[PDB]
Amino acid sequence: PQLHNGLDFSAKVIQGSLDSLPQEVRKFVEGNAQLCQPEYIHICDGSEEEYGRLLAHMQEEGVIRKLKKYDNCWLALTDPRDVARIESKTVIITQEQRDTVPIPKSGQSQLGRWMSEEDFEKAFNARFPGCMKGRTMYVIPFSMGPLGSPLAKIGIELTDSPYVVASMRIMTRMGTSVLEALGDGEFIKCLHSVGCPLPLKKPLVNNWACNPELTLIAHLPDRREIISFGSGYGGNSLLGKKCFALRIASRLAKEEGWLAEHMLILGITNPEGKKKYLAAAFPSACGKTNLAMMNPTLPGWKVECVGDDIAWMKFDAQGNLRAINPENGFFGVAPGTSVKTNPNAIKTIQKNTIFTNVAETSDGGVYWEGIDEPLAPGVTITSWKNKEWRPQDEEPCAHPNSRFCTPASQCPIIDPAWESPEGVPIEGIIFGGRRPAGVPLVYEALSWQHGVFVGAAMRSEAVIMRDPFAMRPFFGYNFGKYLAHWLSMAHRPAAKLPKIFHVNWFRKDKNGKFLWPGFGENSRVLEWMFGRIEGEDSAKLTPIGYVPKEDALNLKGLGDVNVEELFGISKEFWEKEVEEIDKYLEDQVNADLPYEIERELRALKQRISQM
Numbered sequence: 001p002q003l004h005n006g007l008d009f010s011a012k013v014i015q016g017s018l019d020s021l022p023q024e025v026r027k028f029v030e031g032n033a034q035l036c037q038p039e040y041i042h043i044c045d046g047s048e049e050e051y052g053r054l055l056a057h058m059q060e061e062g063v064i065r066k067l068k069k070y071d072n073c074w075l076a077l078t079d080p081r082d083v084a085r086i087e088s089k090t091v092i093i094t095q096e097q098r099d100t101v102p103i104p105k106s107g108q109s110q111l112g113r114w115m116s117e118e119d120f121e122k123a124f125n126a127r128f129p130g131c132m133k134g135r136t137m138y139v140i141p142f143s144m145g146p147l148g149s150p151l152a153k154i155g156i157e158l159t160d161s162p163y164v165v166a167s168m169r170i171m172t173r174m175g176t177s178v179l180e181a182l183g184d185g186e187f188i189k190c191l192h193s194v195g196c197p198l199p200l201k202k203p204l205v206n207n208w209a210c211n212p213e214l215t216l217i218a219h220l221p222d223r224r225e226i227i228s229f230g231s232g233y234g235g236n237s238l239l240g241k242k243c244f245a246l247r248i249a250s251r252l253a254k255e256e257g258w259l260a261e262h263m264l265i266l267g268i269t270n271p272e273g274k275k276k277y278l279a280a281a282f283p284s285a286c287g288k289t290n291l292a293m294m295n296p297t298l299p300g301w302k303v304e305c306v307g308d309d310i311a312w313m314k315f316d317a318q319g320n321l322r323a324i325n326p327e328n329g330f331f332g333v334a335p336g337t338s339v340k341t342n343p344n345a346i347k348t349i350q351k352n353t354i355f356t357n358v359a360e361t362s363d364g365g366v367y368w369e370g371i372d373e374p375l376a377p378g379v380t381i382t383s384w385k386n387k388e389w390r391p392q393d394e395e396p397c398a399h400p401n402s403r404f405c406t407p408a409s410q411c412p413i414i415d416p417a418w419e420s421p422e423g424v425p426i427e428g429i430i431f432g433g434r435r436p437a438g439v440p441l442v443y444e445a446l447s448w449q450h451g452v453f454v455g456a457a458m459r460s461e462a463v464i465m466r467d468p469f470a471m472r473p474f475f476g477y478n479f480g481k482y483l484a485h486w487l488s489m490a491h492r493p494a495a496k497l498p499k500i501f502h503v504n505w506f507r508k509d510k511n512g513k514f515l516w517p518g519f520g521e522n523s524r525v526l527e528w529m530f531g532r533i534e535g536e537d538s539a540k541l542t543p544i545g546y547v548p549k550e551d552a553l554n555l556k557g558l559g560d561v562n563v564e565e566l567f568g569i570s571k572e573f574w575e576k577e578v579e580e581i582d583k584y585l586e587d588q589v590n591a592d593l594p595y596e597i598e599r600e601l602r603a604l605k606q607r608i609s610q611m
């Protein structure tokens with residue numbers, strides 16, 4: 001088979017074996033080993049020992065610190081240049097631009113960023129050759145969704161970051177059982193490098209290898225490849241999450257008749273013990289995680305979490321909309337997480353949890369803005385920038401996009417069906433964002449077509465930005481075709497279309513205070529939705545859809561909440577709103593805008609005119 005050694009990197013394999021790997025997985029590893037020139041190859045087995053030893057190695061290297069207050073919890077602090085998903089360096093490669101984004105009239109699309117094959121190939125060749133010199137290439141075999149669910153898909157991530165390996169063990173199902181379940185089946189090829197070959201040319205900040213200048217997160221859906229360079233952070237480096245499970249998957253979903261969405265999934269149970277599942281799409285930093293593991297204030301009600309971020313949904317042969325959480329953990333925002341805003345998070349993150357860019361207490365614990373847990377006198381705080389921090393410093397102690405990475409299995413209210421291979425049946429879909437004015441607390445769509453329009457029309461504070469379906473950063477293909485795909489669900493055989501709602505937690509009076517207390521009190525909104533799905537006559541028709549009737553919302557124990565301002569619908573506001581939606585859709589979607597969405601816009605405009 002060889003004149004010399006071939007492309008045989010067997011000699012550098014430090015765990016597992018290239019002979020054990022399926023043939024196509026072997027080619028992927030060896031081809032990229034030849035390209036990236038790692039010193040060693042580590043094939044991940046997913047075991048506790050591997051995990052423990054990896055964490056101890058990172059500990060030795062100064063990459064993570066042990067949080068000695070908790071049971072097996074860890075803290076990573078990044079280079080301040082590498083702190084979040086970067087949309088501007090995120091691209092999708094296709095033959096035709098129009099398959100990736102609609103061609104905007106104004107010239108700049110907000111619906112994705114296309115790059116040509118030719119331009120990507122140059123970018124790739126300027127980055128990856130030799131990029132892993134002196135480092136270990138980890139081979140991470142992972143399943144998005146419960147192992148052997150008919151809805152689950154398998155990936156292989158190659159990375160030179162141990163932090164990514166650890167984080168992927170929490171956020172996916174990874175190891176030898178995935179390889180065994182995979183066999184000779186297809187898989188998504190995920191390549192990641194932090195982009196800092198040894199010896200280091202540039203100096204390392206906070207022991208966090210990254211390369212901001214060359215950062216590029218690419219998707220090649222026709223090759224089933226995700227190729228990410230230069231960032232070690234979250235959605236840029238944990239390739240199963242946004243890159244696979246939203247961008248690549250949304251495209252697969254369209255081709256195969258299912259849906260891959262930026263949605264939490266929760267089970268809600270009323271005082272009678274009657275149970276329904278709801279899916280909800282809010283943009284990043286707009287409260288999915290708070291809702292997904294809500295502690296409902298209303299007596300007798302019970303919320304259980306299936307997932308807090310991604311939903312894969314498909315109508316089964318019975319016509320129920322079946323949803324799975326393709327993730328295995330929560331990669332949740334840390335700041336804001338108190339006992340009051342999110343008690344079930346506080347209990348999940350006690351053990352086996354990795355923290356990134358939060359502050360550290362002198363007694364080995366974690367701190368962040370809005371934690372609402374005062375410390376004993378004498379307890380001092382090390383910031384996320386590794387410096388001493390008093391409450392009267394100008395800066396925050398934790399970065400605003402600082403995160404925890406915690407196993408889903410540890411959540412006290414994790415739903416008993418959260419790993420059922422068939423998924424949970426969705427009966428309602430909720431859209432929402434941050435709107436300080438105009439938009440009531442809750443309303444219900446008049447039809448599937450109106451509901452799809454409601455999704456398409458979503459807007460949210462960062463400056464109120466457009467974020468249709470909470471998917472603006474994540475569409476794997478043409479948004480217009482995405483809308484067509486959603487609308488097509490109405491013509492499926494026996495499909496039982498969920499009720500669609502829109503919510504707004506963030507409406508404010510003219511002094512800028514929140515008109516609604518929210519958090520646990522949002523169970524009062526979910527009550528209404530529950531009843532409306534049941535067929536109850538609790539709804540009054542308005543121009544924008546159905547709102548709750550007077551006294552239909554249980555406001556017992558809230559007292560003097562202003563229903564007037566909170567449910568108010570202004571003609572003047574909504575005239576402006578429809579005009580802005582019209583111009584956006586005309587500019588950003590144009591020829592790919594489905595007729596039915598145009599019709600809903602014309603209908604909404606007409607209903608508003610009659611006010």
Ligand SMILES: Nc1nc2c(ncn2[C@@H]2O[C@H](COP(=O)(O)OP(=O)(O)OP(=O)(O)O)[C@@H](O)[C@H]2O)c(=O)[nH]1
Binds near residue numbers: 282308
């Ligand atoms: N006023 C109000 N704010 C809320 C509520 N729920 C969440 N928030 C706010 O939303 C933020 C937390 O939401 P995140 O966890 O960042 O949002 P997310 O949707 O999980 O974001 P990703 O994980 O990045 O997708 C904090 O600023 C909270 O104050 C609510 O019911 N009322």
Ligand SMILES: O=C(O)C(=O)CS(=O)(=O)O
Binds near residue numbers: 235236283284331
């Ligand atoms: O931005 C989001 O919606 C996230 O969930 C965080 S990340 O996975 O993109 O880093």
Ligand SMILES: [Mn+2]
Binds near residue numbers: 061
């Ligand atoms: Mn070393």
Ligand SMILES: [Mn+2]
Binds near residue numbers: 262284309
């Ligand atoms: Mn998200």
Ligand SMILES: [Mn+2]
Binds near residue numbers: 289308333
């Ligand atoms: Mn979240």
Ligand code: NA
Binds near residue numbers: 063076207
């Ligand atoms: Na560090």
